[PDB]
Each structure stands twice: as structure tokens, then as C-alpha cells.
Scaffold this active site. Structure first.
Site, PDB file in Angstrom:
ATOM      1  N   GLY A 125      25.037  12.983 -28.003  1.00 17.20           N
ATOM      2  CA  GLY A 125      24.448  13.275 -26.717  1.00 17.20           C
ATOM      3  C   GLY A 125      24.951  12.331 -25.657  1.00 17.20           C
ATOM      4  O   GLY A 125      24.933  12.666 -24.480  1.00 17.20           O
ATOM      5  N   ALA A 126      25.413  11.152 -26.049  1.00 15.14           N
ATOM      6  CA  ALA A 126      25.901  10.208 -25.049  1.00 15.14           C
ATOM      7  C   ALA A 126      27.133  10.764 -24.356  1.00 15.14           C
ATOM      8  O   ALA A 126      27.296  10.612 -23.153  1.00 15.14           O
ATOM      9  CB  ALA A 126      26.216   8.863 -25.700  1.00 15.14           C
TER      10      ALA A 126
ATOM     11  N   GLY B  19       0.795  -1.214   0.000  1.00 15.42           N
ATOM     12  CA  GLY B  19       0.000   0.000   0.000  1.00 15.42           C
ATOM     13  C   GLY B  19       0.832   1.270   0.000  1.00 15.42           C
ATOM     14  O   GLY B  19       2.017   1.250  -0.341  1.00 15.42           O
ATOM     15  N   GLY B  20       0.212   2.382   0.387  1.00 14.21           N
ATOM     16  CA  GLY B  20       0.932   3.644   0.428  1.00 14.21           C
ATOM     17  C   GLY B  20       2.265   3.570   1.170  1.00 14.21           C
ATOM     18  O   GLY B  20       3.191   4.327   0.861  1.00 14.21           O
TER      19      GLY B  20
END
Lengths: 353, 168, 176, 176
Positions: free
Chosen positions: A242-243, A5-6
Site C-alpha cells: 500500500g505504500a 478560542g474559536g
């Protein structure tokens, strides 16, 4: 143990989350409520088991054999970080060997002549870090990149590097996220970040683009640009587009950027680059079309695919001998440890999510 | 070879050679003849033995003005790097008179800067060893721009980090 | 999606109004296997991190974790309001009873549902409203749906001078 | 004279408009023996240190150290403009040719003085203008003498909100 859960969100926010094999689980919605809604059939261990999150979700940082190996882990983890951000990480200073050890030399031949033959990056790291001790984090997630800690002259550092052994050390969604978050962690707590580079480019695939690689790949860069701790980058081989930019390049504020002669820093692959620069000169003389397209590719990679072009512009501060990588990082952190750099005032930045 | 890992290394050794020997075999003789020491000799005498680490060693310029592209020495005229002095960190640039009369150029100035930005960000002095014969006239205003970005750093850091000028 | 916005609004001193009606998180192996955890956490990071005025209105559904996420006062929200049509409960009645009433539900197989579906009604009538949370203060007030604007208006007037700041740090470490 | 003024105008938040037209530094032995090296360096320090809107308009001459000194962009100027009548060069054409073209003019003692005059022309006609710097972004734009006022106006509007600062220090150490 169970984290359902949360509650699972508290561990998310924290820094490093450690798990144990089938002794603990993490999940928002129970395996049962999943079936009654979609019809999917999965068992706990498969839904949110340790092995799952330590390789599929990227929420876990370590998978131990038993609770003992875990506790010992966290202890190591704590030994690399400070008790709070208002201070540098602990230290056990010990002068290093300024000469070239027989181990150092081993690097002079670690990189094969074959631009297609992989070598294990760990080996590159273990040669710079004290006692060749490398404490790795998330080893099963995003194997194409390695992120961990170590010590140089007794002072804790942080390591990010591309693993040619996996997927050719490519950059992709899972990788960007892995490293990014790590870098910001090492930055928030004054841990320097050594980064070793060798990347061909970004893993192609419509899934990548569709899964938001544009907004998740930036994460890595933002992490690096934002950082202020000492930033030392070592380029061992691949450096494309970009690498190259993304891997703590000087354009991102790095302090010392080394480069081995066995490295090629170029805008794009020689094989594909020419198919754009000579698209014309190649059309002509169909007589031996591919005997020209091949001659070019050779003159390209022999002229541009290297570090010296950059080395001129100053993009790299020096082209070092592999065996001097350690002597470099050592005698380079000693100076950088007093690095004072800050960003523009702000509540906080706005990194992509 | 040159396509192998062993040649790509050997290649470097070759470069670090003509690099530390950018000036002419005669320019050096002349230099010494006048009693003056070479730029790299000024750095060694100053910094702690074996503590010097060079930055921008293999940098070159890109000025095609007045056919200057025929002479693109590694370092472009100045030897910049960091090292220690009496155990304390120090940054230093050494103007190499045996190269273009040691005249300020675009890449020549950029280096002096890269070092002043490093000496300020890490809070260490900046020993400047001069010998500049003047502005590199071929590049025109570019050489003026270089002198500026430097003058601005001299100010911004004035009083923030010891700055010592060695005029030889 | 939201997380990025709340942060965009914070860094730029823009007040954030939030209207709630969320049952819970979309169930699916995919979600879990895609890191829903490290990614859903972002939304609470934004809210908890925020410092600009925060006004949360719950119009209907509000359960378990979801409740927490949607600008709950537990995350720093300044004024949390809820309509009478709202349901602030740790969880859904149906699923809530199958847990709390296990040993009392098995008994009497005869009418195994007229004691279940009947008990479910007791919950959705006793706990599926805002008064429980409001009872303690998790909600500053319950108001007539028609007074939402009047509240958001006269409210923001007070919060426009809100001074809040997190502990000093180079930056944070939001789950990426 | 200017140094102390630029600093006064800075210390009190008064933008500094600069109009340039200078050949170089007054020659003279007495000057050297008097301290021009350090007494003149003040001007650049004053400009470098300045953190107010600095709009520089070059009307004509702009040579060597003189250009740099007069509120150049390399010192922190916000808007450096230049009229079509601006000579942005490292040095005057007269002297530039003596160094640049020494052996290419030594040839033919006769027909030399015309080879010089020719060069000097080819040089100035291709270098003593502002367009050079205009490619390297050293000047934000080459305008029409007619738009000087309109430029300073619409320009001081944007800079009146500029935040600049030097490294933290007890005080600078300007020459004296």
C-alpha cells in the site's frame, strides 16, 4: 500574536499558517481553564507555542526566527501560487539545459549499495529544481516526508517525497495528513506535484491503528486520486504494498512514473514475503532450515525486488538513469502542462476526516 | 556486481541495449533491404532531434499460449512515446515489423492505448506508424480486444485531436 | 465524527437537522497537542460548505466557539430556533465576570464573593438566554419546546427547494 | 446499413439490442476496391460513439474483426452475453491451424491430413467457445438461450439510467 478560542479555527481553514518563536500562540482553551478541569500543568509556549504546533499538532506550516523572516516567507509562498484558481501559478520561463550537467551525474551514486543505508532526499529534489532552490513547508512536522515547492524551467511545482533520513521514510498518521493536505492545495491551485518515492511500508504500532490510521492514511490516496494537475512520480528505491500505491502511483492517475534501477517495487518485503510463499518448502529439510530460507530470500530480492516486474505491466513508463531524472521531469512537464482531466460532477467529494 | 548501485545501473544500460535491438540482426537487414526503415528510425526521422521520450520501453507480454513465453522482447513489438514536431507536442507509436511480424498483441495494444490516452488528455496529435503484419494469432481473442480498445479511442478522439496514420 | 456526516448528507441532498446543547470544547493539553484546531475546524467546514436545508434547534447550552460550530446561522443555516431554556452567550457567566469585572471585583475584599457570585447572577439572568441573539436575528425565533416538530415540519417544506452553490473550484481544501 | 441505424437509434435515445453470429467479412476484390476498409469502419464508429444502453447477445459465430465490430464490449457495450453455442475466437479453426501449425504438420506428408483434422478438432474443441473471453471479462456472462429475454429485461432496467458522453467536439469525423 495570540489566537485563542474559536478564532483559532479561521487559521485552520486557511491554507498556509506561519508562526514566530514565542511571539505568537494558538489554542482553543486557555492554559488556566485546562488545569481547573483536568489538573494538567502547561505553559503557553508549551500548550500552543510556535514550536509546539510546528511539530506536534500539524496546524502550523513554518516557524520563523522573527516577524521579518515570516513576512519574507509568505511572500515566497505567494510567489509559487496563482492569485486565484482560475489561473496557472505565475511564471518566469527560462529554457533548461537539456544535456547532463555534472550535478545530474551526482545522482548516479547518491543511493548507497546498502539497502539499509539512508541518503538525504533533499539532495534528490535539489537536483531537479531550478537553482537547486527548494522551498520547504512544515519541515519540523512529520519529518519522515517532505512537502514543498520549487521551480522547473521557471514554472512553480509542488514536491512530496519520503525522507529516508527520518524514521526510514515510513508512512504514518502524521505523514499521510501532512502530504495529503499539501497535495490537495497544489491541486486546487493548478500547481503540478512532483513526488519522489522511497518507503518500506507503514509505521507499525497499536497506537497507529487505534488512532485511526485507516481513515487518516487514505487521506493521502484520496488526495492523489482526486488531483488533476500534472502528476509526475519518481521511484528511487523502496516501493512496498500500500505504500507504493499511496505515493502517486500510476494506478492513482499519475501521468509519468519514472523508476531508478536502484528501486524495488514489490507487494511486500523479500524477507517477510518468502515466509509465506515457502512456509512449506522451508519446513521440509530442517537440515539447514535457515540456509534455505536465506537462499530463497536472496533469489527473491534478486528476482522480484526491482522495477522491471512493474516496468513490464506498464506500472512505470520507464526505468531511467538517476542522472536523467531532471532531463525527464523538464521534458515531461512541457507536455503535461496542457493536461485536461476532470472528475465526476458533485457538490464536493467525501474525503475521510 | 549486481547487488551494488553501480551494477544495478550498468544493468540498465545492458537492458536499454537489447531493448532498442529487440528484432533479429537479420530482420533489420531484411527490413532495410526492402527500403523500409526500422521502427525506431521512423520515429527519429519524424520527431524533433532529441525530443523523443519513450514509454513502455521495457514492457513485455505474458501469453503462455503456444509457448510464446520463450520470446518476450522488450517493447513487445511497438515503440511508443511522445516528442515534438516542429516545436509542437506530438504522441506517436511505431509498429516494429522486425518483432513477431509486428503483430498486435495484448501488451502491444495496451501500449498503443497508453499513448492515445496521453495524447488525448494533453491534447496533442497521434502520429501512428503502422507495419502490423496481422493479429498475434497465439493470444486468440486477447488480440481482438486490443484492436477494440483502440478502435474506441479512435472514435472518442475523432475530431478532438489530429490523428494521422503512416502506413509503410 | 459529525463533520463527516454533515458532508455525507450534503453530497447526497439529505437535509440536516441539528439540536444544540454544547458548553464548550473539552479542555486538555492532549486536544491542543493533537490538533484539535485543524480537526474541530472540520465541523464548521461541513456546515459552511453544506447546501442542503439546514435547521438548527438550540435546546439549552450554546457558548463561544461551540455555538458557532453547531450549525449557527453564521455558517449558512437556513432556520435557527432556540428554546426558552437556551443560553446563547459569548461565554459562561462565572468566567465572564472574572474578566469584565477585575478592577471592580478587587475593591472591597470584604464580601469579595457576595459581590461576585451576586454579579454572576446578574449576568446569567441578563445575558444567559436566547433573547440577546434573537434580538438581532442570530436566531430566527424562540419557540415553545412543544412546537419544535411543527417548526421542523412546516420548515423543511419551504427549504426542500433550496438553491445554493459555493464558488466554482476543482474541490475545497478542508483541514485534514 | 447498420451503421446509420445504430447512430439514429442513439441520437434519439433508443437502446440498441445486438444479436451476433458472423463468420467474418465477405471476401471479394470488388469489395476491397470499393472501400470496405472505410465504409465498414462505420459500424464500429457507430457503436463506439454510441452512449445508450447496449446489450450484446452472441448466438453463434464471432470471429476476428467481425466480432469486434458487432457491438463488442471493447467498443463500449454495457452487457455482452453469450450462449453456450458461441464461437469467440480470433479466427476459424480451419485457417488457424495453417498458420499456428505449419512445421508441426509438414512432417509426414502422409498421415498429415489426419494430423490436421486432429488439430482442427483439438483447437475448436478448446477455443471456438465463449469461455475464453469469459475469463477476460470480454463477455459479462455465458447464459442459457432460455434466459436471453429475462436477461435483456432485468438488464435494460439497470442501464436505462446510464450517463455516457464523449470528449467535447464540434462533431466527430466518421469515415464517409
Amino acid at each position: 500574536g495570540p489566537c485563542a478560542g474559536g478564532a483559532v479555527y479561521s487559521p485552520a481553514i486557511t491554507d498556509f499558517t506561519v508562526m514566530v518563536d514565542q511571539t505568537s500562540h494558538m489554542f482553543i482553551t486557555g492554559p488556566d481553564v485546562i488545569k481547573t478541569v483536568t489538573g494538567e500543568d502547561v505553559g503557553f509556549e508549551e500548550l500552543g507555542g510556535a514550536r509546539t504546533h510546528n511539530s506536534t499538532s500539524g496546524v502550523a506550516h513554518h516557524m520563523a526566527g522573527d516577524e521579518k523572516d515570516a513576512v519574507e516567507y509568505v511572500k515566497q509562498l505567494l510567489s509559487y501560487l496563482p492569485s486565484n484558481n482560475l489561473s496557472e501559478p505565475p511564471a518566469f520561463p527560462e529554457e533548461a539545459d537539456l544535456a547532463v550537467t555534472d550535478e545530474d551525474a551526482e545522482l548516479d551514486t547518491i543511493v548507497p549499495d546498502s539497502a539499509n543505508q539512508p541518503y538525504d532526499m533533499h539532495s534528490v529534489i535539489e537536483h531537479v529544481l531550478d537553482d537547486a532552490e527548494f522551498f520547504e513547508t512544515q519541515p519540523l512536522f512529520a519529518p519522515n516526508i517532505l512537502t514543498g515547492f520549487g521551480r522547473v524551467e521557471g514554472r512553480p511545482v509542488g514536491i512530496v517525497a519520503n525522507q529516508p533520513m527520518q524514521f526510514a521514510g515510513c508512512l504514518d498518521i502524521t505523514a499521510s495528513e501532512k502530504a495529503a493536505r499539501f497535495v490537495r492545495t497544489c491541486d486546487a491551485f493548478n500547481v503540478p506535484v512532483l513526488t519522489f518515492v522511497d518507503v518500506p511500508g507503514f509505521l507499525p504500532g497499536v497506537d497507529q491503528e487505534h488512532d485511526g490510521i485507516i481513515r487518516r492514511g487514505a487521506k493521502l490516496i484520496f488526495a492523489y486520486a482526486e488531483a488533476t494537475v500534472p502528476l509526475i512520480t519518481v521511484i528511487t528505491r523502496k516501493a512496498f504494498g500500500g505504500a507504493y500505491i499511496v505515493m502517486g502511483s500510476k494506478h492513482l492517475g499519475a501521468d509519468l512514473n519514472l523508476a531508478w534501477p536502484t528501486a524495488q517495487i514489490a507487494v511486500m518485503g523479500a524477507q517477510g514475503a518468502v515466509n509465506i510463499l515457502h512456509r512449506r518448502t522451508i519446513a521440509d529439510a530442517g537440515d539447514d532450515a535457515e540456509a534455505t530460507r536465506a537462499r530463497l530470500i536472496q533469489e527473491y530480492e534478486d528476482a522480484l525486488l526491482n522495477p522491471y516486474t512493474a516496468a513490464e505491466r506498464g506500472y512505470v513508463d520507464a526505468v531511467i538513469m538517476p542522472s536523467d531524472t531532471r532531463r525527464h521531469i523538464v521534458r515531461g512537464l512541457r507536455q503535461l502542462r496542457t493536461k485536461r482531466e476532470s472528475l465526476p460532477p458533485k457538490k464536493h467529494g467525501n474525503i475521510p476526516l | 556486481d549486481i547487488h551494488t548501485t553501480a551494477g544495478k545501473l550498468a544493468d540498465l544500460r545492458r537492458r536499454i541495449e537489447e531493448a532498442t535491438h529487440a528484432g533479429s540482426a537479420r530482420a533489420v537487414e531484411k527490413q532495410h533491404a526492402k527500403g523500409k526503415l526500422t521502427a525506431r528510425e521512423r520515429i527519429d526521422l519524424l520527431l524533433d532531434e532529441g525530443s523523443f521520450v519513450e514509454l513502455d520501453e521495457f514492457a513485455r507480454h505474458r501469453s503462455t499460449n503456444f509457448g510464446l513465453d520463450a520470446n518476450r522482447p522488450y517493447g513487445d513489438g511497438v515503440v511508443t512515446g511522445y516528442g515534438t514536431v516542429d516545436g509542437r507536442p506530438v504522441a506517436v507509436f511505431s509498429q516494429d515489423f522486425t518483432v513477431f511480424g509486428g503483430a498486435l498483441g495484448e501488451v502491444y495494444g495496451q501500449k498503443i492505448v497508453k499513448v492515445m490516452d496521453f495524447a488525448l488528455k494533453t491534447g496533442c496529435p497521434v502520429v501512428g506508424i503502422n507495419d502490423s503484419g496481422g493479429a498475434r494469432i497465439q493470444e486468440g481473442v486477447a488480440s481482438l480486444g486490443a484492436y477494440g480498445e483502440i478502435f474506441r479511442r479512435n472514435t472518442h478522439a475523432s475530431g478532438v485531436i489530429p490523428q494521422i496514420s503512416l502506413v509503410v
